[PDB]
Amino acid sequence: EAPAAVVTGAAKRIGRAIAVKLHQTGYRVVIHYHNSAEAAVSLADELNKERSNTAVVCQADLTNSNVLPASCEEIINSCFRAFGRCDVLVNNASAFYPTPLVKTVETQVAELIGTNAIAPFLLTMSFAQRQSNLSIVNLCDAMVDQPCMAFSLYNMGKHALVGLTQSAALELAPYGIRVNGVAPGVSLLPVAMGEEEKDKWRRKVPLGRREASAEQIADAVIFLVSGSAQYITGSIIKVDGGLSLVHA
Amino acid sequence: MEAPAAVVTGAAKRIGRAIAVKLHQTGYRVVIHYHNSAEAAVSLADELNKERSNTAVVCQADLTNSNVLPASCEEIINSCFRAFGRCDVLVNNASAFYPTPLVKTVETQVAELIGTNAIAPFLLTMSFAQRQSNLSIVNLCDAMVDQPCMAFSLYNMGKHALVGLTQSAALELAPYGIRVNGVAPGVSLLPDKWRRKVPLGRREASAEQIADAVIFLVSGSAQYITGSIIKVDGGLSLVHA
Amino acid sequence: EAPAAVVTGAAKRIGRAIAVKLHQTGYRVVIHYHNSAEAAVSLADELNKERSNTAVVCQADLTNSNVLPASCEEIINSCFRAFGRCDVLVNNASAFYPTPLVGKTVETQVAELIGTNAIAPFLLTMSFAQRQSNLSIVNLCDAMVDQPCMAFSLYNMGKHALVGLTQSAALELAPYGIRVNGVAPGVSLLPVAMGEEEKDKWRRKVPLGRREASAEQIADAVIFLVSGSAQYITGSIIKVDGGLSLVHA
Amino acid sequence: EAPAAVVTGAAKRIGRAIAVKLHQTGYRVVIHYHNSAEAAVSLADELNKERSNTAVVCQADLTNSNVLPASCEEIINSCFRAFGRCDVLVNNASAFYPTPLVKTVETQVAELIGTNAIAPFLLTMSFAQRQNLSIVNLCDAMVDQPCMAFSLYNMGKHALVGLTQSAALELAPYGIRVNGVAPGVSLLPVAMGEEEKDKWRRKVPLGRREASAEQIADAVIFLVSGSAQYITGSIIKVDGGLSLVHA
Numbered sequence A: 001e002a003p004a005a006v007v008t009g010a011a012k013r014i015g016r017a018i019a020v021k022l023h024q025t026g027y028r029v030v031i032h033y034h035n036s037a038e039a040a041v042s043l044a045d046e047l048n049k050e051r052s053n054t055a056v057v058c059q060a061d062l063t064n065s066n067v068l069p070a071s072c073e074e075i076i077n078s079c080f081r082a083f084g085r086c087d088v089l090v091n092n093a094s095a096f097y098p099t100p101l102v103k104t105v106e107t108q109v110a111e112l113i114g115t116n117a118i119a120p121f122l123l124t125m126s127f128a129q130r131q132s133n134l135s136i137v138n139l140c141d142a143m144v145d146q147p148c149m150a151f152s153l154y155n156m157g158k159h160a161l162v163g164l165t166q167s168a169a170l171e172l173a174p175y176g177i178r179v180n181g182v183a184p185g186v187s188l189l190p191v192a193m194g195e196e197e198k199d200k201w202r203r204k205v206p207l208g209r210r211e212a213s214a215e216q217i218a219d220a221v222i223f224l225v226s227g228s229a230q231y232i233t234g235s236i237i238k239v240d241g242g243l244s245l246v247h248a
Numbered sequence B: 001m002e003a004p005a006a007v008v009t010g011a012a013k014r015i016g017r018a019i020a021v022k023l024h025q026t027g028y029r030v031v032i033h034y035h036n037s038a039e040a041a042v043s044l045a046d047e048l049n050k051e052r053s054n055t056a057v058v059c060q061a062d063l064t065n066s067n068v069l070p071a072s073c074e075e076i077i078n079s080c081f082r083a084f085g086r087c088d089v090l091v092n093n094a095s096a097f098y099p100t101p102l103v104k105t106v107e108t109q110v111a112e113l114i115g116t117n118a119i120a121p122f123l124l125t126m127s128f129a130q131r132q133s134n135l136s137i138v139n140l141c142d143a144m145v146d147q148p149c150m151a152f153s154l155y156n157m158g159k160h161a162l163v164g165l166t167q168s169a170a171l172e173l174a175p176y177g178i179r180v181n182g183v184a185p186g187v188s189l190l191p192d193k194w195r196r197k198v199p200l201g202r203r204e205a206s207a208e209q210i211a212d213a214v215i216f217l218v219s220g221s222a223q224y225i226t227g228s229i230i231k232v233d234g235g236l237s238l239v240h241a
Numbered sequence C: 001e002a003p004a005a006v007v008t009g010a011a012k013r014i015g016r017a018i019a020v021k022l023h024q025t026g027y028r029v030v031i032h033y034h035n036s037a038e039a040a041v042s043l044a045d046e047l048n049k050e051r052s053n054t055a056v057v058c059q060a061d062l063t064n065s066n067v068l069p070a071s072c073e074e075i076i077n078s079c080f081r082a083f084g085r086c087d088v089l090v091n092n093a094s095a096f097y098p099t100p101l102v103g104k105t106v107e108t109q110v111a112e113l114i115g116t117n118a119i120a121p122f123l124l125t126m127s128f129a130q131r132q133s134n135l136s137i138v139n140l141c142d143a144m145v146d147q148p149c150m151a152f153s154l155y156n157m158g159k160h161a162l163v164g165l166t167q168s169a170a171l172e173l174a175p176y177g178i179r180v181n182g183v184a185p186g187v188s189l190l191p192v193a194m195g196e197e198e199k200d201k202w203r204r205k206v207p208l209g210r211r212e213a214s215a216e217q218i219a220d221a222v223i224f225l226v227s228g229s230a231q232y233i234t235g236s237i238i239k240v241d242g243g244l245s246l247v248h249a
Numbered sequence D: 001e002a003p004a005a006v007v008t009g010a011a012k013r014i015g016r017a018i019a020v021k022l023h024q025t026g027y028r029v030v031i032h033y034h035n036s037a038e039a040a041v042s043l044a045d046e047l048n049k050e051r052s053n054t055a056v057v058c059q060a061d062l063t064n065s066n067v068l069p070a071s072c073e074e075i076i077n078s079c080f081r082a083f084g085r086c087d088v089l090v091n092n093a094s095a096f097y098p099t100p101l102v103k104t105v106e107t108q109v110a111e112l113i114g115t116n117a118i119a120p121f122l123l124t125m126s127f128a129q130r131q132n133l134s135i136v137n138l139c140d141a142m143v144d145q146p147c148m149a150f151s152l153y154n155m156g157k158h159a160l161v162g163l164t165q166s167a168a169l170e171l172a173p174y175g176i177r178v179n180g181v182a183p184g185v186s187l188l189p190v191a192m193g194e195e196e197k198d199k200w201r202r203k204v205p206l207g208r209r210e211a212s213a214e215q216i217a218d219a220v221i222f223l224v225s226g227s228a229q230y231i232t233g234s235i236i237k238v239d240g241g242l243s244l245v246h247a
């Protein structure tokens, strides 16, 4: 009777807040993870303590390669194995690091374009081929047109994800699958980043001079998958505190 | 007094009514603004006050641009403060819509099309902010703003100006904690060829579907969202010619 | 015969550079001005001294009012009275100043900021089209239209409206062979009013050379758009901003 | 000292026209090709007959693979070996075919994302590493109103927008400008029946025809010229208003 959702990169940070808030809403969840095995299992434990048999984990590398289609097929298949259905796909997993124009480059291309764009395409195809309020939500980037300097590949990946969001909204609408995006500006800052750099970014945000909580991002995801967004497809909701509006 | 309060312009019919109703159902007190639709405005106010008495008032004003528009807009915001003691939400919904081919005087067309669609929203936004917790404004935009209807230059200029206001006001009022966002319908309630162009189910949006996006944006679930415009268009804007 | 162009606010700065560059390419020019009468006449003189009977001036307030349509009709009429034709319209004139949401009356500011930046371009476009070869319109837009200066809401509304006009008019006049495009400076000639230190703050933002656009660089893009090399281009807005619009906060 | 330009996919159609018009402006050219050797060589011969030793050909597959970075480095190097310099890169080559959601899919990924996005990135990096310098990328005016069932193609073209913007921003301190030209409907497929061609043509507000190759080429010539010295990160539509037309 309960719908089911796949969330990629759901062990930590935003994806985890997404999976949690989906579960709170009624969904059974596949918690996809790559390296964060302890966190993934520990999230699924917490969720199944609340409602037994409502969470499973699924391990996969989302780097592009000739087995990526199979991995993506397996993420979707795992949702069907555990819950008999797959109502929502959340494309959240993401590699993020600089690739200056001036790891081999082909690995960087595989990681940054694979995770951020190719895996979402492949997951979207498998989601669709396996098929009610069906929908996909892609995690985009509010700053996609005012990119971080030296992040060409990352940015290319997120731009492609906009393209996917739109193309798949158009193509899947006849099957009643909605496809939308949520575009954070500055949400949870990289664990790697020092606290002076974190406040630099925080200070740019017109609304409150702080980053988005992961929960604030999830809230937008929840709206998009909900029955209050039934006529919404191809839309990318910025959740950025106005940051994208701010000139240099 | 702890129930928040909303002003919705053009609230007597169609999308504005639906927005007023849904806000009221969420627990808002509402100012139902109207220009010509007195009977309808009052009838809605009646229905809502039957649900919860003294939660709905009406306010008449022409939103055409003129020398008296700033005072009319200021009095709309005042009416919310008079009735309810606070003004938490402004929904800029009223809109004039008609062709103005490039090939009523043109200056009257400017006054109604740019006035109702952009200038009144600007003035209402100014009065709303001057008078000031989850404070927000929602502007009713247009999903087809960049693929406009042929011969609708002034309407389109006004809806583009409204994107501008949405973004400018979001930036400038963020320090006051006033969020400013937009909802952009495609084809909603018609004023069949059109229905068939929509990817998502070959139908128009109900007014309620538009309202749903407004309710989201005013909610505590959108507390970090400002300067965003959510399309509610069933994919129509994605469809090439 | 030589083609003819109208340039609004052409007495000084970017408008002058546009009129000059159009005249150098072979156009006869109407130099529209509002307050800058000495500068406009002085410009027409210089151009006429390079080639007789190729420049006139035309004074008009482009503030919105009930007479704005007549004024815009008269601008276009001036070009047909002077040159027997009107091939190109450059909507360059612009009022620019803050209008904080939180001096002049607000209705005056609306009239100036929406009138000059949007309404007069719409009426001029209407007149240009109705009074009718490579016919085109170029609207001076703003590359920062989606990252606006704080407290510039009416100016920004006007520049957004002008984007809309650009697109609506390109759509609607394409059947008549009239192209409509835009040119969108980021930081070009800074306000005369602005102190050097404030100017250098803006300059420092620009990735491409950390300087503002020259007036000539803006004009070059106008000249492309009116040219035979832009015959298939309509509804395009070209940023001339040295990458400024791409820079995050 | 004549400047030098690399044009990818320069043997035919839009790329050919770009190469010709660059050559007419005074550029020496590297005509890059994949399968169209005879057309590429005939263009080179034509251009050399006009001015000796001003055109060379360079064969390379721009599909993504382990060797694409070396291929892209070789293209750029061929310009320097032939002409002693490389002033302009035009990323024009493109694969284009439907990839419905409902060749292996990874080969589709390699061809569509490789030609349209990864190869321009690699080329751009090699161009920059080796340094009026500018790059022009051939984008798509319909990128936000895509053809149904062209997700991978559209993804590639959106990525190219991101490249164009990202490279503009990063390369601006080295004085390298990076821009795009976005055709709407230009030269239609070779096989497409006229009746199908006319459905597309009829959609275009400005003259109900597709853009010539030369018309697209004109915008590229503008962007590489001294008249665009402050233009970077700009994408000029050359679409006859098509992108403005609602469904």
Ligand SMILES: NC(=O)c1ccc[n+]([C@@H]2O[C@H](COP(=O)([O-])OP(=O)(O)OC[C@H]3O[C@@H](n4cnc5c(N)ncnc54)[C@H](OP(=O)(O)O)[C@@H]3O)[C@@H](O)[C@H]2O)c1
Binding pocket: A008, A009, A010, A011, A012, A013, A014, A015, A032, A033, A034, A035, A036, A037, A060, A061, A062, A063, A091, A092, A093, A094, A095, A096, A111, A115, A139, A140, A141, A142, A183, A184, A185, A186, A187, A188, A189
């Ligand atoms: N945080 C922000 O400020 C911000 C800003 C703009 C956009 N976003 C977007 O919002 C989404 C969530 O953001 P976030 O900061 O929570 O992301 P994140 O923590 O940087 O990454 C989320 C997860 O992606 C997974 N991932 C990385 N490489 C992968 C690979 N090769 N295969 C499979 N999974 C891989 C990781 O899983 P394991 O941990 O299991 O390895 C990781 O925990 C992302 O799409 C991001 O680009 C975030």
Ligand SMILES: NC(=O)c1ccc[n+]([C@@H]2O[C@H](COP(=O)([O-])OP(=O)(O)OC[C@H]3O[C@@H](n4cnc5c(N)ncnc54)[C@H](OP(=O)(O)O)[C@@H]3O)[C@@H](O)[C@H]2O)c1
Binding pocket: B009, B010, B011, B012, B013, B014, B015, B016, B033, B034, B035, B036, B037, B038, B061, B062, B063, B064, B092, B093, B094, B095, B096, B097, B112, B116, B140, B141, B142, B143, B184, B185, B186, B187, B188, B189, B190
């Ligand atoms: N329905 C759609 O397909 C669609 C598409 C795109 C955008 N939108 C936007 O969605 C919003 C609501 O759409 P709708 O179809 O419900 O609107 P609508 O029925 O065209 O107009 C709504 C109300 O605006 C008020 N209004 C019109 N001219 C006025 C004036 N001079 N002064 C004061 N009020 C005036 C009227 O109030 P009185 O009746 O009291 O005189 C009218 O009932 C609008 O902003 C519209 O532009 C709608």
Ligand SMILES: NC(=O)c1ccc[n+]([C@@H]2O[C@H](COP(=O)([O-])OP(=O)(O)OC[C@H]3O[C@@H](n4cnc5c(N)ncnc54)[C@H](OP(=O)(O)O)[C@@H]3O)[C@@H](O)[C@H]2O)c1
Binding pocket: C008, C009, C010, C011, C012, C013, C014, C015, C032, C033, C034, C035, C036, C037, C060, C061, C062, C063, C091, C092, C093, C094, C095, C096, C112, C116, C140, C141, C142, C143, C184, C185, C186, C187, C188, C189, C190, C191
């Ligand atoms: N300068 C920049 O950095 C920059 C940046 C972004 C966009 N732009 C745009 O590029 C264009 C040219 O810029 P600019 O700096 O050269 O412009 P500007 O000097 O601010 O103004 C140009 C001319 O506009 C005319 N004007 C102002 N108010 C008017 C009115 N009420 N009636 C008629 N004319 C009026 C004036 O004519 P008189 O002198 O005769 O009175 C003035 O000389 C403008 O459209 C502007 O918005 C410029």
Ligand SMILES: NC(=O)c1ccc[n+]([C@@H]2O[C@H](COP(=O)([O-])OP(=O)(O)OC[C@H]3O[C@@H](n4cnc5c(N)ncnc54)[C@H](OP(=O)(O)O)[C@@H]3O)[C@@H](O)[C@H]2O)c1
Binding pocket: D008, D009, D010, D011, D012, D013, D014, D015, D032, D033, D034, D035, D036, D037, D060, D061, D062, D063, D091, D092, D093, D094, D095, D096, D111, D115, D138, D139, D140, D141, D182, D183, D184, D185, D186, D187, D188
């Ligand atoms: N034609 C249009 O209406 C239109 C519309 C929108 C955008 N565009 C863009 O404008 C540009 C030029 O258009 P077009 O119609 O002239 O292009 P096209 O004829 O489809 O492709 C141009 C060339 O791309 C090369 N190419 C294809 N796959 C390749 C690979 N794997 N490796 C290396 N080269 C490869 C081919 O070279 P060989 O022949 O040598 O094998 C081909 O001649 C493209 O970027 C296109 O996407 C065109």
Ligand SMILES: Nc1nnc(NCc2cccs2)s1
Binding pocket: A094, A095, A096, A185, A186, A187, A188, A189, A190, A201
């Ligand atoms: N996977 C990720 N995508 N984008 C991210 N943004 C992290 C930020 C870095 C600086 C401001 S936000 S993590």
Ligand SMILES: Nc1nnc(NCc2cccs2)s1
Binding pocket: B095, B096, B097, B186, B187, B188, B189, B190, B191, B194
């Ligand atoms: N007031 C109004 N603004 N925009 C409106 N759109 C109504 C249309 C719906 C479908 C084609 S036109 S009404």
Ligand SMILES: Nc1nnc(NCc2cccs2)s1
Binding pocket: C094, C095, C096, C186, C187, C188, C189, C190, C191, C202
């Ligand atoms: N009329 C005018 N519109 N925009 C102008 N730009 C002037 C600038 C002010 C700050 C940076 S550029 S003048």
Ligand SMILES: Nc1nnc(NCc2cccs2)s1
Binding pocket: D094, D095, D096, D184, D185, D186, D187, D188, D189, D200
């Ligand atoms: N490589 C190519 N990219 N885009 C192309 N477009 C050809 C067509 C344009 C419109 C219908 S088919 S070829």
